[PDB]
Amino acid sequence: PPLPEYGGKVRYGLIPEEFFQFLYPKTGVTGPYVLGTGLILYALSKEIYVISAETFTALSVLGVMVYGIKKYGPFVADFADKLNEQKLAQLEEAKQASIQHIQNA
Amino acid sequence: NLFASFIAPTILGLPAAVLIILFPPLLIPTSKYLINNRLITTQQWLIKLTSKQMMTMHNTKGRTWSLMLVSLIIFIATTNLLGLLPHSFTPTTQLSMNLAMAIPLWAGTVIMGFRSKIKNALAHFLPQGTPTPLIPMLVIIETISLLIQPMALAVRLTANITAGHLLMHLIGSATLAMSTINLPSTLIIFTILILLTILEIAVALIQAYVFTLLVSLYLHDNT
Amino acid sequence: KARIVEYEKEMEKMKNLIPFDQMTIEDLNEAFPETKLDKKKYPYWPHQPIENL
Amino acid sequence: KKLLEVKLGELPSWILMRDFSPSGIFGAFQRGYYRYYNKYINVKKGSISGITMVLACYVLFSYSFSYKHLKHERLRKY
Amino acid sequence: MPQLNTTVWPTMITPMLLTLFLITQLKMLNTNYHLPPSPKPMKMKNYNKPW
Amino acid sequence: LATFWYYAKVELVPPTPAEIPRAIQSLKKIVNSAQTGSFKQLTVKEAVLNGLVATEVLMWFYVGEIIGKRGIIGYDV
Amino acid sequence: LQSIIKNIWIPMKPYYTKVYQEIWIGMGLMGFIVYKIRAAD
Secondary structure (H helix, E strand, O other), X not given: OOOOOOOOOEEOOOEEHHHHHXXXXXXXXXXXXXXXXXXXXXXXXXXXXXXXXXXXXXXXXXXXXXXXXHHXXXXXXXXXHHHHHHHHHHHHHHHHHHHXXXXXO | OOOHHHOOOEXXXXXOHHHHHXXXXXXXXXXXXXXXXXHHHHHHHHHHHHHHHHHOOOOOOHHHHXXXXXXXXXXXXXXXXXXXXXXXXXXXXXXXXXXXXXXXXXXXXXXXXXXXXXXXXXXXXXXXXXXXXXXXXXXXXXXXXXXXXXXXXXXXXXXXXXXXXXXXXXXXXXXXXXXXXXXXXXXXXXXXXXXXXHHHHHHHHHHHHHHHHHHHHHHHOXX | OHHHHHHHHHHHHHHOOOXXXXXXXXXXXXXXXXXXXXXXXXXXXXXXXXXXX | OOOOOOOOOOOOHHHHHOOOOHHHHXXXXXXXXXXXXXXXXXXXXXXXXXXXXXXXXXXXXXXXHOHHHHOOOOOOOO | OHHHOHHHHHHHHHHHHXXXXXXXXXXXXXXXXXXXXXXXXXXXXXXXXXX | OOHHHHHHOOOOOOOOOOOHHHHHXXXXXXXXXXXXXXXXXXXXXXXXXXXXXXXXXXXXHHHHHHOXXXXXXXXXX | OOOOOOOOHHHHHHHXXXXXXXXXXXXXXXXXXXXXXXXXX
16 A cells, blocks of 8 residues: 655644634634643643743754754755665666566576 | 652653653554654664664674663663653653663673683683782773673763753753843843753763663673 | 567566556565575565665 | 444443453453554655654653652642 | 763663664564566476376 | 734734724624523534633733733743 | 564573673672662662
């Protein structure tokens, strides 16, 4: 069975487009965003999210992750695609080779 | 207060450490296909490179541990990397898990060396061309070395990972304590924290590789 | 002529292979049997010499 | 026709019609894993979002059990 | 040091032995590298004509 | 930038005095459906959607609270 | 019992029975050490 060609259309690497489409009818385009900002402000206002040293280690590792992704993402995607293309080319070559061998026989 | 991130986590009273230790293999999906997605492609390339690195130096009997040593390095590296995310509990900071990883493998290698190989196993404690009046001393040394190899394995992982985390946390506190004071100094401390984060990624991978390489050498000295 | 009809059957078989991106590994070991792991000579993973990898 | 998937079925009896067995919960978790995997990971030309979403859920879980320690670091009292 | 509290030591050892010796190894066993598709166009156990 | 406002002018604005009767009628419809228990017609899809919108307006209330105590984190005193 | 030992123990049998025997002895040793540590505590 062949795989699809694209994934699930995530936004910001965290939330899929299905959520934005699901809130589009009742709360429009800014609905999900005001829900997100409201939840963030309620979390860090009622001190559900306690600001500590882990906030800054979190910001550091998230910055390193976003930078590393934006930088070495094209390279890793192209590397995987080229690995698959080389394997496919080698396989097609080795199939035609045996066809030619039996035709020669 | 300071070692709060190394205490066995519990959610609603249950040992979440079990889930945290079982999670790493979930990030390695496998497939029967011949040409598959980018994640499995990159992971299989990495596993092949790792196997060729760790296992080419062994003979036919040491190469039966390819599964064991590749599993060890993959498990430790993924645990150490997942320990870098915010608020996470890293099980490789625990001396219990690291002792349970180190003692079985080292003991298995030395018992494998004493079951077969027994002549060469007992000869290994003496270097080849050791002069005569020094033969006793170099047997007291080498012996205790062979007896600290397991502990010095586990500790070397624990003491490292723990320490790294501690340092980062402390620097984090610094930034927080400096957020209400001069902001250029806060940005300088934050840049130190970013460099430390990159160093901690490197040390995660390096510690996985070194634990596995020392186990591999103990195996190579007994096959 | 017997050998030739066998060869023609085999060439039809090779010509009617499923494309390689719908192909499992058992299908490859059926198509090109030289791509099969010698799980008798090498019983343990990776079932081949490490240099072969 | 009470096999209606949740998000389509309004009833509480449906809640008790499900297979709340160990094998049932195992099948439920495995079906969820394969739904996520087929939607986000098991595609060609896949994205890294299929991993960063897992890591975000992991960080949320990690914060959940780290709250009993952080609630002593709150900077207000109410 | 919470690492010295020996009461939670089994909780840290028992899942590891499942993850290191069972699950990761079952996932490496399903990571197989087939041998190259090398097609020999030289394979003909022939013989001279009947003379 | 400005697209935020392009959507906010239609969505994130207060209700004009002309459409408060519409809101009163909708509130009456909701309380009626709660009275007669007719909400057993609402699929859990739409139930979740309504719950999310109610959570959003509660978050509006809490944002109004943080703008009414002049301090974001907790109570400044 | 079925489809578990078909997907867990049939693949891992060559290793559990032949390759890791010394690992099993060493794991007994490790359990003994851990018992002596937890008991003297």
